[PDB]
Amino acid sequence: EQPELEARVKEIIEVDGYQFRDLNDNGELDPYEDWRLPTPERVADLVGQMSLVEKSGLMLINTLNAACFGVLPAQADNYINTQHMHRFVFRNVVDVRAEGVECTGTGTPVVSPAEAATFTNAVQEMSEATRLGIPSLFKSNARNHIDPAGAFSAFPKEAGIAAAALGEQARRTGEATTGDMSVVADFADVMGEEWASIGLRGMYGYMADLSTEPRWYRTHETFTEDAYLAAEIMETLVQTLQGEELTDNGLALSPQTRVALTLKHFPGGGPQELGLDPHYAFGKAQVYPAGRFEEHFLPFQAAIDAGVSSIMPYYGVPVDVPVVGGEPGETYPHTGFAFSDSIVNGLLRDQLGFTGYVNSATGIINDRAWGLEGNTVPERVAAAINGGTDTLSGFSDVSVITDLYEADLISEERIDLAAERLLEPLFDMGLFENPYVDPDVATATVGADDHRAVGLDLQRKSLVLLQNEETDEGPVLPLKEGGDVYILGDFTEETVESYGYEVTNGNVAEGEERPSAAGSDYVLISMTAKTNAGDYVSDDPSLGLNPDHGTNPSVIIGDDGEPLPGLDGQSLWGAADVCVHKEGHEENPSCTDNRLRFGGAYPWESSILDFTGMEAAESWEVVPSLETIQEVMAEVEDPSKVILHVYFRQPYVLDEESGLRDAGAILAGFGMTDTALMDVLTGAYAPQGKLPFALAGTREAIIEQDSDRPGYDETEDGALYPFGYGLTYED
């Protein structure tokens, strides 16, 4: 009964034989401070006592990073006392800093697990110190995946976790449908304990988006293209991270909730047109040529039914999509999902039954109010809140919500309803009783030996064997013991040496002679492709306003009957950026798309996913360069002695002209260490993963495939490797 209670500013009061935290510091037990009453009654009493601005402060969520290790940043006082915010996004890398690190510049420091816990405890202490002592919630993007983070236990990327899951279901069933969720559960158990231990109880994620459009740069963090497998992953992720104890309101929230998920990006951010992402003005559009809008919010249905705490809608504009459960011929507003009542209030809450709160994507008011290009900031804030969005990521100006209330552009009925939905989980999660964590217990949880072992295990099972030729001497893989080995790509020489091979290193500096691979028993290449689009400028005549770069075929007709600027299907790629069309209320607006900060290629190269194409592209880079790989593969005798490990960050195309298909073995890796790849390469473990998305063999397939449809079975050329494909060793 008596829950653990910590209080560093307000004090504890004993009542009816129990102890309670006096958070209003009135000296008396208020029903909201009484942990014995149902959550609704505590909310009602708390909401009852709050000022208007106090309730408005709940509708904001903003970056609050530790600074230098783990001091509170400049804006903490302003956010907590002037804006009355209680929701923050924590973005520092958590790891052990190398000797010598001298905090300098205006970057974002690395902090140890205890330093992070110390910083988040300080924020909770500043929160306790506010008039009513409401606690704080921190959110974070994922931290547990290898970037091919810090001291968090390392796992393959999301698609690698699905690969492991599919492949373990096949090794026990001979079938790859929706996977063995024990793999996912085992992953999420490690993430939960490590996050909770630093006082990190909220997540911007995971992504339920489907990888049905291979040209979308964010396929790097999607699990799969299959709605049904996504649905099963979402279900297990919520059950493991939030728990299976549901409130009467149907939310998996207890004090035993380690991380409350904000599933993103509703209703599904996968089917972007030409793969262009709506962080940017040319990529506002989401299109559904195969009519799978219903399929794409299916994982969200599964997460909602398991009680996910929160939903983040995406920036995208759904084009000509029938309202689900509406009168025929009706379509959803051609505006960002977060501003459409039909989506946030109608689809999500009425049709899919969501009873939680809604968290906008970051920066929808100032930067990405798609469909509301001409509207003001106060107008955009009102439309988002009135459409159904309860908290605004990236907006930190509480006075705008209060001005809108006094101008009757938002009601007290709406703000109260927001306050109740945002406050509810903090209550069910037990943060009103104890919101603190032990820094020292963080140091013993984040990156524990058994946690790293579960990751390494998931790493080894994520690897997908695509190709393993049978030579005269048997299959290429596993490697035979010992030999001369050529390495190229991100291989650590000594690590490969340590398995007892004499290693020739083809990775040399620019001004240096690469040793030839001639006479090698084995060539190990580890390769990928990156975008390199940091030079992009929307209003530069040589780039975004360059007629030689073509036109943006995306058409979005505004509900008002006229096309959105730059999206009439005839305009220069850059013309959609506000710095070009200037329809806002600002003198010389800055460009939203410059430097393509978030990822993705130049929009006019978004369809170049084949390695030959990418080598030649302006804003794509093959690493190591396709030229070098091809030199190397010819210097060896039989290409059958080259083993390609490919990081398919996007469903890249092994095109026939590149010759990569001539390798004796090809593997799909979704993020792993040298030592985990070597253990599978040498046969200490057999590969058993299966593809969670299909791979194509021609650029024509990439351009023909329906952005909302999984696979390439509707194309002339079709798939090189189907979903669910993966070899193993056969002895």
In whole angstroms, how close is the CB of 208 to ligand C3G at the nearest point? 12
Helices then strands, counting H and E runs in the chain, come out as 21, 25
The entry of ligand C3G, Zn ion, none near residue 348 (CB within 5 to 8 angstroms by kind) is: none
Q: What is the dihedral of CA 440, 446, 449, 451, to 10 degrees?
A: 140
Cα 700 to Cα 274: distance, rounded to the nearest angstrom: 13
Q: Which stretch binds Zn ion (CB under 5 A): 62-70, 92-100, 560-568, 590-598?
A: 560-568
The entry of Zn ion, ligand C3G, none near residue 590 (CB within 5 to 8 angstroms by kind) is: none
Cα 655 to Cα 554: distance, rounded to the nearest angstrom: 27
In whole angstroms, how close is the CB of 600 to ligand C3G at the nearest point? 12
CB neighbour burial string for 623-643, b if at least 16 within 10 angstroms, e if fewer: bbebebbbebbebbeebbbbb
- How far the first Cα of the chain sits from its last, in Å, is 57
Cα 204 to Cα 206: distance, rounded to the nearest angstrom: 7
In whole angstroms, how close is the CB of 81 to ligand C3G at the nearest point? 23
DSSP-derived pairing of the beta strands 665-669 and 464-468 = antiparallel
The entry of ligand C3G, Zn ion, none near residue 359 (CB within 5 to 8 angstroms by kind) is: none
- Restricting to residues 450-479, which ones interact with Zn ion according to CB under 5 A? 474
- Restricting to residues 105-144, which ones interact with Zn ion according to CB under 5 A? 134
Distances, alpha carbon 127 to alpha carbons 77, 79, 285, 359, 601, in Å:
10, 10, 40, 21, 42
In whole angstroms, how close is the CB of 162 to Zn ion at the nearest point? 16
The entry of Zn ion, ligand C3G, none near residue 411 (CB within 5 to 8 angstroms by kind) is: none
- Restricting to residues 268-297, which ones interact with Zn ion according to CB under 5 A? 272-273, 276, 278, 283, 285
Contact 459, 676 (CB under 8 A): yes
In whole angstroms, how close is the CB of 246 to ligand C3G at the nearest point? 25
Cα 406 to Cα 388: distance, rounded to the nearest angstrom: 19
Among 220, 265, 279, 292, binds Zn ion (CB under 5 A): 220
The entry of Zn ion, ligand C3G, none near residue 285 (CB within 5 to 8 angstroms by kind) is: Zn ion
Phi, psi (deg, nearest 5) at residue 13: -120, 135
Q: Amino acid letter at 88?
A: F
The entry of ligand C3G, Zn ion, none near residue 709 (CB within 5 to 8 angstroms by kind) is: Zn ion
User: In terms of CB distance, is 24 or 351 closer to Zn ion?
Assistant: 24
Residues that bind ligand C3G (CB under 6 A): 89, 141, 204, 264, 361-363, 393-394
What letter does residue 373 receive in the DSSP assignment? Answer: T
- Restricting to residues 299-358, which ones interact with Zn ion according to CB under 5 A? none
In whole angstroms, how close is the CB of 412 to Zn ion at the nearest point? 5
User: In terms of CB distance, is 354 or 648 closer to Zn ion?
Assistant: 648
Cα 709 to Cα 609: distance, rounded to the nearest angstrom: 18
Q: At what angle do helices 158-173 and 227-242 cross, to 10 degrees?
A: 100
User: In terms of CB distance, is 141 or 351 closer to ligand C3G?
Assistant: 141
User: In terms of CB distance, is 63 or 326 closer to Zn ion?
Assistant: 63
Contacts of 66 (CB under 8 A, 6+ apart): 72, 73, 90, 92, 109, 111, 115, 116, 119
Distances, alpha carbon 677 to alpha carbons 499, 670, 686, in Å:
12, 11, 11
CB neighbour burial string for 168-186, b if at least 16 within 10 angstroms, e if fewer: bbbbeeeebebbbbebbeb
Q: Is 6 in the site for Zn ion (CB under 5 A)?
A: no
In whole angstroms, how close is the CB of 101 to Zn ion at the nearest point? 26
The entry of ligand C3G, Zn ion, none near residue 204 (CB within 5 to 8 angstroms by kind) is: ligand C3G
The entry of ligand C3G, Zn ion, none near residue 54 (CB within 5 to 8 angstroms by kind) is: Zn ion
User: In terms of CB distance, is 679 or 706 closer to Zn ion?
Assistant: 706
The entry of Zn ion, ligand C3G, none near residue 141 (CB within 5 to 8 angstroms by kind) is: ligand C3G
User: In terms of CB distance, is 264 or 460 closer to ligand C3G?
Assistant: 264
Decide: helix, strand or coil at residue 557: strand
The entry of ligand C3G, Zn ion, none near residue 362 (CB within 5 to 8 angstroms by kind) is: ligand C3G
Q: Is 709 in the site for Zn ion (CB under 5 A)?
A: yes
Please give the residue ranges that form the binding site for Zn ion (CB under 5 A). 22, 24, 26, 30, 54, 57, 84, 134, 212, 220, 272-273, 276, 278, 283, 285, 397-399, 438, 440, 448, 474, 548, 558, 562, 585, 649, 705-706, 709
